[PDB]
């Protein structure tokens, strides 16, 4: 759904089956060679960075992913719980899913939540509280 010209920071695309967000994109022409794009991704699943090139033709599928704010409520040790701070819709996350999130949880803190396919991936607090 998306093509190399459109590439840019924050754009969310599907890369090797993984949800990703573009950190930075650089167009380059080698003298003597084919032109192409040097792209860096944040892989929202593994949190890891990765870097890849594309010739001018190539595309990637759009990924539906968005960051919503919710307040952390509680944890059962398995899932962690939130609700949108907009209409108060409740959502829960997998243990791993929250990831590094765990040690920063203050009940009633309002966080930002990375969400793919109506299901949550990553959790980013208000920096420090």
Curated annotation (Swiss-Prot):
Cellular compartment(s): Cytoplasm
Keyword terms, alphabetized: Cytoplasm, Elongation factor, Hydroxylation, Protein biosynthesis
N6-(3,6-diaminohexanoyl)-5-hydroxylysine: residues bearing it: 32
GO biological process, one term: peptide biosynthetic process
Gene Ontology molecular functions: translation elongation factor activity
UniProt key word RNA-binding: no
One of the record's GO cellular component terms: cytoplasm
Post-translational modification comment from the UniProt entry: May be beta-lysylated on the epsilon-amino group of Lys-32 by the combined action of EpmA and EpmB, and then hydroxylated on the C5 position of the same residue by EpmC (if this protein is present). Lysylation is critical for the stimulatory effect of EF-P on peptide-bond formation. The lysylation moiety may extend toward the peptidyltransferase center and stabilize the terminal 3-CCA end of the tRNA. Hydroxylation of the C5 position on Lys-32 may allow additional potential stabilizing hydrogen-bond interactions with the P-tRNA.
Biological pathway: Protein biosynthesis; polypeptide chain elongation
Lineage top rank: taxon: Bacteria
General function of this protein: Involved in peptide bond synthesis. Alleviates ribosome stalling that occurs when 3 or more consecutive Pro residues or the sequence PPG is present in a protein, possibly by augmenting the peptidyl transferase activity of the ribosome. Modification of Lys-32 is required for alleviation.
Family: Belongs to the elongation factor P family.
The protein's name: Elongation factor P
Source species of the chain: Coxiella burnetii (strain RSA 493 / Nine Mile phase I)
Lineage per the UniProt record: Bacteria, Pseudomonadati, Pseudomonadota, Gammaproteobacteria, Legionellales
Gene (name only): efp
Whole sequence portion shown: 3 to 131 of 188
């Amino acid at each position: 759904t998306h093509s190399t010209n459109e590439f840019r920071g924050g754009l969310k695309v599907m890369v090797d089956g993984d949800p990703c967000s573009i950190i930075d994109n650089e167009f380059v022409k080698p003298g003597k060679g084919q032109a192409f794009n040097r792209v860096k991704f944040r892989n929202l699943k593994t949190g890891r960075v990765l870097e890849r090139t594309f010739k001018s033709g190539e595309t990637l599928p759009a990924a539906d992913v968005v960051e919503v704010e919710m307040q952390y409520l509680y944890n059962d040790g398995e899932f962690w719980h939130f609700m949108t701070s907009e209409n108060y819709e409740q959502h829960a996350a997998s243990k791993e899913a929250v990831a590094e999130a765990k040690q920063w949880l203050k009940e009633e803190a309002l966080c930002m939540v990375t969400m793919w396919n109506g299901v949550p991936l990553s959790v980013e607090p208000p920096n420090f509280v």
